[PDB]
Amino acid sequence: NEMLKHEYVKVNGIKMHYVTQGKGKLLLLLHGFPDFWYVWRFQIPALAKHFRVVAPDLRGYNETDKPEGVENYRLDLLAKDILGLIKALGEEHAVVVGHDWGGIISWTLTAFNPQAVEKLVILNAPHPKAYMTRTKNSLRQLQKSWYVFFFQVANIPEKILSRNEFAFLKNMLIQSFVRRDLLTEEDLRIYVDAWSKSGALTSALNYYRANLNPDIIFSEKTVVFPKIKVPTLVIWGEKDVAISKDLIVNMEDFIEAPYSIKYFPECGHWVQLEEPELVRKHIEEFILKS
Amino acid sequence: NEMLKHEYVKVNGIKMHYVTQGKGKLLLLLHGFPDFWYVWRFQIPALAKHFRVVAPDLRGYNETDKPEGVENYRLDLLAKDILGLIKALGEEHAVVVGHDWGGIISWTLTAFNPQAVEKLVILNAPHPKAYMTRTKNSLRQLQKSWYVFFFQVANIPEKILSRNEFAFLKNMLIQSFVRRDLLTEEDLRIYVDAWSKSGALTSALNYYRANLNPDIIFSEKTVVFPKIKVPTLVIWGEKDVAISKDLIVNMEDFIEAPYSIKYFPECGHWVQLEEPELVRKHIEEFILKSDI
Ligand SMILES: [Cl-]
Ligand SMILES: [Cl-]
Ligand SMILES: [Cl-]
């Protein structure tokens, strides 16, 4: 866009890059792996027609700072980055939309800090308690999560993912799309630029090492996780090659607030790229509802 | 059984435990993970009607020695253990039947030492060159091999697998079976005893660390592997949660000698437990009621 603006702001001891367009109610769009703000390229101008849209690069990604060490990527710290971002942007609360890791962070932010979240929207991101409790008993989820186990190993995943101009990552994306030409060559050049930022791949992989290591996946005991107390919308592409439907059933046990789920039976993990207008529509309607 | 006998023998620098029953033509039964000789409990007395059956515990398992270190579980060493066992049993060769890792070892033994193998029977074990070439290009195989990646981590998988009397491992097995009651309460007690042997879990996991680490899976090299020169029967349970059919089709470069494949469309990885009589019948027919 011409109206899209790049900004950097200090939050939670790190500098965060974001793009923004629009005025009004603050709406955050939070990417996951192996994306960055640009995954929201279709939604930013559309949502910016009625809202102040901010799409940051999460800790470790693209133009945001990249602290060294696995411990710097624990979910508690990632959610504190977003809490800090809302404060730094001059709001008491935001509408928070998260996909993939951005959605895991959003569930966490909303649970522990409901005062900062006006409404929560989740795209293809399991609730932490659901993944922690259920994965060990879902052979289909364990199989879909093969690469989570691969990413635990030091050094090798960085090497394999980066080889031949990130051929693996390009493939991972393509294999996940429900039409396999969903990204253009222009998109891919922009993705490679973000992937090639010094330290970005290791930092992204550290999310898996910090938060989805085998102790967490195969924990004998359930975790304590506060109920969600804000209205919540889940958008769920059912042909997700990374997440089994086993993990999104029954979110209401975790939510003490209005809850709605919109299934997209013929979309996969990148629902916002596959049905960009329907996704935008559902978001706008849910936010304008009250 | 009453006629089953336990023995220990020194081979390839380690002491190996095995059970034996029967007299006549020597037949080896080689288990995989997370089994030991006892996976062959149904087949041993039945095959002992026509063969001298020997079912060893592989290096690292149950009553066999358990050398320290990942490097001691490379496939070449494991195959040399079995070559040594055949020699130690007083014969020049044996019929070799292998399931899972025992099958991978059997492919390797047969390729590099064909004079020691009379005939080869493989149950749900991909040819090493097929797994090495194809896995990295097969999303379905990579997904099925989630646990291969899990097992690469030091210490943690041993802890998780062993906790609460091997609750994980029992679950892993059950989720892999397509028949009920393959493990009775009595069988489970016996399994837990073997699993609990000092160093056994680490040694079993070292097969995956030594031979199927991510560098090996994703390597852009083709592997050298001799052609199979002994008659070979592959038995394949199609509902295998661990191995994609991508890895068993198209053997043509790999085998020179006569080859037969028997698919079991309604069995999984543990085909010898799920259709024990049909599996035994195909083995007996192939070995003793052969062609040219
Ligand atoms: Cl749950
Ligand atoms: Cl749909
Ligand atoms: Cl069958």
Centre of ligand 2 to C-alpha A266, Å, is 4
- Write the single-letter amino acid at A290: S
d(CA A160, CA B65): 36
**Count: domains in chain B:** 1
CATH number at residue B130: 3.40.50.1820
DSSP characters over A123-174: ES---HHHHHHHGGG-HHHHHHTHHHHHTTSSSHHHHHHHHHHHHHHHHHHH
SS3 content of chain B, % helix, strand, coil (to 5): 45, 20, 35
d(CA B280, CA B43): 7
Q: Most A CBs within 10 Å: which of B138, B141, B146, as the mutation test of the A interface?
A: B146
The two tokens of residue B44 are 């041993």
* Cβ pair A153:B218 closer than 8 A: no
| Closest of B3, B7, B125 to residue B57, by C-alpha | B7
Query: Helix B200-211 and helix B185-195: axis angle, to 10°?
Result: 70
Name, in order, each residue with C-beta under 8 angstroms of B282's C-beta and a sequence gap of 6 or more. Answer: B233, B235, B262
SS3 content of chain A, % helix, strand, coil (to 5): 45, 20, 35
d(CA B94, CA B110): 10
d(CA A219, CA A221): 5
Nearest residue on chain A to B163, judged by CA atoms? A220
d(CA A245, CA B40): 38
CA distance B135 to chain A (A): 13
- CA B92 to chain centroid: 22
C-alpha distance from residue A95 to each of A41, A118, A219, B93, B200 (Å):
18, 5, 32, 73, 53
Centre of ligand 2 to C-alpha A274, Å, is 9
In the structure, ligand 3 is a single-atom ion and the residues with CB under 5 Å from it are B 264, 266-267
CB B245 within 8 A of CB B134: no
d(CA B145, CA B227): 26
CA distance A149 to chain B (A): 5
Q: What one-character DSSP code corresponds to residue A268?
A: -
Q: What angle do CA B261, B262, B264 make, to 5 degrees?
A: 140
Q: Most B CBs within 10 Å: which of A139, A145, A215, A244, as the mutation test of the B interface?
A: A139
* Sign (positive or negative) of CA dihedral B205, B207, B209, B213: negative
Centre of ligand 3 to C-alpha A274, Å, is 40
d(CA A208, CA A223): 18
CA distance A74 to chain B (A): 19
| Resolution of the experimental model, in Å, one decimal | 1.4
d(CA A231, CA A113): 14
d(CA B19, CA B38): 9
Expressed as residue numbers, the domain containing A32 is 1-290
